[PDB]
Amino acid sequence: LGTENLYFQSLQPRRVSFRGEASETLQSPGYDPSRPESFFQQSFQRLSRLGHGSYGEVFKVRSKEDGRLYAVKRSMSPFRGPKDRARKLAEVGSHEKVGQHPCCVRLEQAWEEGGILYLQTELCGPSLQQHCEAWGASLPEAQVWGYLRDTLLALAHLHSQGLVHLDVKPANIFLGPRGRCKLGDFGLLVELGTAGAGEVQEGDPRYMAPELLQGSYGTAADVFSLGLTILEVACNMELPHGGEGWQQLRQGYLPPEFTAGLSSELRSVLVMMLEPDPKLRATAEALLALPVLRQ
């Protein structure tokens, strides 16, 4: 990748896909390629900004094609070059590899224009982080068990295919109707056994599995991250980025000032998920087999 001819070469949208229909031309009611506005500008009603960061922005939109609501994630600035472009496009690939699942945020379509990547997904509710902020307290365990089960279902789906999300956290879990949720943000997702060697994009340090400090990547890392995710939302407990507390949470410590009110059942499951040794840590499939996590 770091050596292509025409390294610097950079107008109308091109579909990004699983090599099915695409590579392809896009069309839409409201879109005329000879007008200078982008496909995104012409083909959607932009309703609000749902999120933003160094990556770009996510908008709530209404599609002019079907009049339905979606989210569109748009990258910040034109591709830096071939490696940046490949890195960003790989998020679409990760969706293709994951495939559709009721506990994963669904990708509807993706395209690039003018060096910008656009991912149009289903519109979900707020993140679990945002939900906890609105609640202003610990979530009732009845809510927690549902979110735990749904995100475990998502992880089992990824893990069965040798995929690791690597950034499981409340901010990347989105609420659905009637108590469900979905795992999203596949930007850091990796397929084990494929380079880059030291497949090095790092998730949020608050939720990182301890074995990742020595580069031991595996599906078990996601189970640990989800354990801390659920601990945080069930206890309204801020997680340390580092220091003594960060180490203790990775040595089996459950702070009594925060966790004394957990049911024995939920505590028991969290201990399984937070096991420091990834070889001993429960798998998502194994957790989902526990009667307490049944349908």
Which CB sits closer to ligand P48, 122 or 275?
A: 122
Q: What is the CA radius of gyration of the chain?
A: 20
Q: Tell me if residue 29 falls in helix, strand or coil.
A: coil
The H or E element spanning position 225 is helix 220-235
167 is catalytic: yes
Which CB sits closer to ligand P48, 13 or 56?
A: 56
DSSP state of 242: S
Q: Determine if residue 217 is labeled as part of a ligand binding site.
A: no
Which CB sits closer to ligand P48, 71 or 273?
A: 71
Site for ligand P48 in 164-203 (CB under 6 A): 174, 184-185
Out of 61, 71, 234, 274, point to the residue binding ligand P48 (CB under 6 A): 71
Nearest to 71, CA basis, from 128, 107, 123 = 123
* Active-site annotation holder among 167, 204, 222, 277: 167
Pairing relationship of beta strands 173-175 and 190-191 according to DSSP bridges: unpaired
Hey, what are 108's tokens?
Answer: 């509807």
CB of 259 to ligand P48, least distance (A): 28
**Cβ-contact 250, 273 below 8 angstroms:** no
Query: Per CB under 6 A, does 51 bind ligand P48?
Result: yes
Out of 105, 154, 223, 270, point to the residue binding ligand P48 (CB under 6 A): 105
Query: Per CB under 6 A, does 50 bind ligand P48?
Result: yes
Nearest to 129, CA basis, from 223, 204, 54 = 204
CB of 193 to ligand P48, least distance (A): 25
Q: How far apart are CA 254 and CA 261, in angstroms?
A: 12
Q: How far apart are CA 79 and CA 190, in angstroms?
A: 21
Which CB sits closer to ligand P48, 58 or 212?
A: 58
Site for ligand P48 in 116-145 (CB under 6 A): 121, 123-126, 130
Site for ligand P48 in 210-249 (CB under 6 A): none
Distances (CA, A) of 82 to 75, 114, 254: 15, 14, 45
Would you call 280 exposed, middle or buried from its count of C-beta atoms within 10 A (0-12, 13-18, 19+)?
Answer: exposed
Place of tokens 């749902």: 50
Number of residues that bind ligand P48 (CB under 6 A): 16
Which residues define the annotated binding site for ATP?
50-58, 73
Which residues participate in the annotated binding site for Mg(2+)?
172, 185, 187
Residues that bind ligand P48 (CB under 6 A): 50-51, 55, 58, 71, 73, 105, 121, 123-126, 130, 174, 184-185
Q: Which residues are annotated as a binding site?
A: 50-58, 73, 172, 185, 187
Active site residues: 167
